[PDB]
Design a protein around this ligand. Structure first.
Ligand SMILES: Nc1ncnc2c1ncn2[C@@H]1O[C@H](COP(=O)(O)OP(=O)(O)O)[C@@H](O)[C@H]1O
Ligand SMILES: Nc1ncnc2c1ncn2[C@@H]1O[C@H](COP(=O)(O)OP(=O)(O)O)[C@@H](O)[C@H]1O
Lengths: 295, 126, 225, 295, 227
């Protein structure tokens, strides 16, 4: 029935003991915050995959006169340079990117390329993929900075070290979020145990009056739900608190330094309904499984 | 009288003609200076191309020795200072194509005005 | 119309008494049935068996409505509304008042609230706890907590109301002061079960007597002392 | 005394509270492990500076009017810098690198830029060798904007904000540990009350038998400190497994780049006598204060 | 000086009838004085007053071998060794048997191990229900759970061995032996007392019967009966 006569006893229930009832909120906030840290570094990897290049990638440049002109590859020289690149078997996903379709994706990956970009913005590139990271050293030897094919770039072999840092810290964040989730699920598991221990006077009365079996555990469930909302209400604020605490040394300076793609509060805020729904779901299920085998 | 009112201004007319003539041989210095400067600012986007990868913050994506990466940042921050001052050095030459180049045209118009004035006054003799 | 059980045993560990090996009791309408004996006969287990919190390993349980031997859990509390009982520590919330403690059951079963708050003084003015019932029961004396205990069984319309452990740590003079309140509620028609442990009561009332001796009927004559 | 009797009831307390003790003994490990990881990363942070702390240099960069005019040093403004900079406490030897000399140094350091890279690339270098690295504050606050010197911006203290991004997360680990600390003292302080309901059948006899007050709460006191000791014992193994599972590849890739002083089992176990006594102190003091107030 | 209490007063939450007043009553060894006061009034105050658990706001309280009106840091268990009380309920440990339950009060003082095992074949036979010394407290019946509850207070021979309402949920046709074993402790030489609304039964012994109605003593007969 109406929740007005059900809300008036739960506040008294938090009022009787205060030295135990406040501890759970910060622990669930820490668990949710580290899990959201893992989510935000996964989304950071997803955003940084767009600006950077993946682990099957080794691009190549072309000769200056060939790259500075010859937009249509119907001529002899563009096909000759393309076949010179395609002599080896490493060519898999070369793209027809030259000049007019090469300005927009290249002004966003680096900020100082947009400076004085009116004259000689970007020549022909023809970015190509790779299947063998251990066997393209001779390919880079043939396609080195010798006159002809210009200098190349390889986003691996002590170059993708930031990716190897971030996925490892993402997995470490996943592991510590798992052990915080285990601690959280056991502490809100024995929440109802110590609550029924501290409120054992009326339990036999509720078994005596003959009320419905669904309605007996409803105050404990609404205390679990309001405790979950109290946890997530400071969990969504502690991320901003630690950002404004210890992100001002960098903030957006990695955008000009081209380390990360983007950072903004809305990217973290995109994950909040999923984490609060999973939090109230885990709170409800451990309420139900603990009440099933105790009374 | 009116014949005698000539030689007091041939000196000023020759001075005006020589002031036009040497400034015609002095206006070429600004266009020669921009003809020296503009080649270093036209394909600098191609100079930072070929995977430049150095920008003055990290200098850490390649490493062989700790001593050899010190000048990868200690010189690159001075490069950041120089590309900050490069726009000022470019505009200090670009202002010469905006300021103090219409003075030759103004002097030519003033010389033509003096020529028609001298043609107007000389009707007392002729 | 016949509310009793027979051959109903639980057998927790058997040993001295496997609950109730053989019973042949009978409860009538308005029947006052005594229950005394030794301490180890298994009285409170049989009290829990009538309210069906103890699993009957043998026999079938039914009090005047339906067989509760094999019933689903949603229909388990559907018999418990007409069942009342009292205990030693009284299960009283010290923060609540006297009226709040008895109206808590009324507001937690869930009815029309305008038909709940109006009938609180309609049935609360029967015990001596009426008057100064807005105060906390901690400062009150020892004679009025049993009134609050029997009030929450008095407010509904009972049929299987019961009285187990009726006196405890209470004087014989106050016992004679409370037997009459415990008997006047039986004049409506609802029977009660007398489940004391004293022999000073049997001569005083002279009603139906059932005595158990470790699961066996010690004495059963249903008349007189 | 009777120390032999104390070992038989601790297992009874463990078995009677099997679904209760496990969450708090698991989360005290994470509580001390956050502090241990923070101490490990600040030790790595101030040990990674030692790869350049032995070779701390400095510089003086002079105004382009007396560098673009002359290649070598033949001006009185350059000759003034031979004496006006050498009269300092933190100077070893001055070196006058030309625009050509430092330009060729930058070219052989990295083949970068074509048009601007030359005489007008950057002014000449007056390298000043620093005596002590600890006195860099007096170095960069002793000389200011003066005629002949365009900037007194350093070149060798500048790695410090490059690991300020590590420092920020290093102090953020300490901040996370101190945020979880309030809940940690709460979850160890409510143990004397959430376990008192289980031992109701035995606590009532010491209140009148004649048992000494120093020996009554000692079985309640020993549980918290044994829990804290096994918590730090499983916490150091957790640091071992997160180092050996999720902190090996990036550590090896940066140690091959020799930017770090590297950690091992012995380095992490070096701090451990401090954190064990810290953990048993925050167990024992809180458990000793909560018994008088709770009981 | 032996046990003397007077002028006790402990009012809680502005109680109108705290049942502690200026009763200058004197107790003695030998005759055991039984309180017949009203229920729910004052019977629990005697144990907490005599064991210095509920200190009165006024009135100096004296015991035989110590001081009750003033305590210190280490004197708070000093009286508790030579006295003993048994409550109504059993509170036995189901983790140990009956033989180990009576020895649980031996190690809490700091007794040496030479006399720990040297007294358990000396006091267990003094109890009427000596038992099999291997009985579970849960398995045993409700008749014998209180005699083993008072046996553990007997093992040190305390000077005070009172017990409030020793029957509990026990029939009086079986509780007579439990009542009749108390005079063994009484002619041991100690002081015993019990406060129970047990009229028409204790008048057979015709012992000292007192009553405290509302903090007022209405009877002080040395060998009287229930009023
Ligand atoms: N869960 C149980 N496990 C073992 N024995 C039990 C259990 N419940 C009840 N008993 C036994 O049944 C008997 C019930 O006695 P009971 O008549 O309830 O005593 P009283 O009337 O004094 O409460 C007890 O002696 C006890 O030994
Ligand atoms: N410090 C105190 N705080 C609250 N209540 C007290 C205190 N001291 C005594 N009382 C009350 O005094 C009453 C004494 O009644 P008593 O006859 O001892 O009850 P019982 O017959 O149940 O033992 C108790 O009900 C108790 O609530």
């Amino acid at each position: 029935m109406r929740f007005g006569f059900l809300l008036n006893e739960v506040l008294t229930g938090f009022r009787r003991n205060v030295t135990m009832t406040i501890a759970m909120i910060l622990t669930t906030a820490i668990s949710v915050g580290l899990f959201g840290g893992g989510m935000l570094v996964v989304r950071l990897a997803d955003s940084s995959r767009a600006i950077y290049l993946d682990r099957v990638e080794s691009q190549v440049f072309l000769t200056e006169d060939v790259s500075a002109n010859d937009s249509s590859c119907d001529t002899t020289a563009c096909k000759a340079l393309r076949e010179k690149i395609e002599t080896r078997s490493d060519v898999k996903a070369v793209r027809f990117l030259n000049r007019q379709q090469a300005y927009d994706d290249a002004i966003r990956k680096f900020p100082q390329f947009k400076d004085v970009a009116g004259k000689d913005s970007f020549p022909a590139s023809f970015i190509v993929k790779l299947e063998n990271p251990e066997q393209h050293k001779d390919f880079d030897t043939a396609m080195k900075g010798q006159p002809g094919v210009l200098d190349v770039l390889n986003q691996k072999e002590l170059i993708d070290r930031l990716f190897a840092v971030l996925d490892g810290l993402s997995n470490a964040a996943f592991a510590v979020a798992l052990v915080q989730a285990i601690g959280a699920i056991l502490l809100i598991a024995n929440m109802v145990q110590v609550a029924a221990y501290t409120r054992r006077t009326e339990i036999g009365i509720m078994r005596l009056v003959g009320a419905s079996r669904w309605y007996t555990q409803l105050p404990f469930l609404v205390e679990a739900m309001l405790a979950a909302t109290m946890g997530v209400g400071i969990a969504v604020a502690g991320l901003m608190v630690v950002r404004a605490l210890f992100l001002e040394n960098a903030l957006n300076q990695f955008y000009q330094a081209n380390l990360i793609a983007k950072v903004d509060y809305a990217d973290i805020l995109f994950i909040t309904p999923w984490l609060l729904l999973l939090g109230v779901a885990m709170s409800g299920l451990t309420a139900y499984l603990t009440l099933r085998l105790y009374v | 009288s009116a014949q005698l009112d000539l030689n007091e201004k041939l000196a000023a007319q020759r001075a005006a003609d020589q002031k036009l003539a040497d400034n015609r041989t002095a206006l070429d210095a600004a266009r020669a200076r921009l003809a020296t400067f503009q080649t270093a600012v036209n394909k600098v986007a191609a100079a930072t191309y070929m995977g430049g990868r150095t920008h003055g913050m990290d200098a850490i994506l390649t490493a062989e020795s700790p001593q050899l990466l010190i000048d990868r940042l200690s010189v690159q921050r001075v490069m950041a200072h120089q590309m900050s001052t490069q726009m000022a050095r470019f505009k200090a030459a670009g202002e010469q194509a905006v300021k103090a180049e219409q003075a030759a045209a103004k002097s030519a118009a003033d010389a033509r005005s003096a020529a028609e004035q001298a043609a107007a006054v000389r009707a007392n003799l002729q | 119309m016949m509310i009793t059980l027979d051959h109903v045993t639980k057998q927790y560990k058997s040993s001295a008494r496997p609950a109730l090996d053989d019973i042949n009791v009978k409860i009538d309408k308005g029947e006052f049935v005594f229950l005394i004996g030794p301490s180890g006969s298994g009285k409170s287990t049989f009290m829990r068996l009538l309210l069906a919190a103890e699993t009957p390993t043998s026999g079938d349980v039914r009090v005047s409505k339906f067989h509760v031997n094999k019933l689903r859990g949603r229909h388990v509390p559907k018999l418990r509304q007409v069942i009342g009982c009292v205990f030693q520590d009284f299960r009283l919330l010290q923060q609540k008042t006297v009226y709040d403690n008895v109206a808590f059951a009324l507001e937690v079963i869930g009815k029309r609230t305008d038909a709940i708050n109006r009938v609180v003084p309609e049935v609360l003015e029967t015990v001596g706890l009426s008057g100064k019932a807005n105060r906390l029961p901690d400062e009150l004396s020892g004679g009025e907590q049993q009134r609050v205990a029997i009030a929450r069984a008095f407010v509904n319309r009972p049929l299987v109301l019961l009285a187990d452990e009726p006196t405890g740590n209470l004087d014989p003079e106050t016992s004679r002061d409370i037997m009459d309140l415990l008997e006047r509620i039986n004049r409506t028609g609802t029977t009660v079960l007398m489940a004391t442990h004293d022999h000073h009561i049997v001569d005083s009332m002279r009603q139906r007597v059932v005595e158990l001796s470790l699961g066996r009927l010690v004495r059963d004559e249903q008349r007189g002392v």
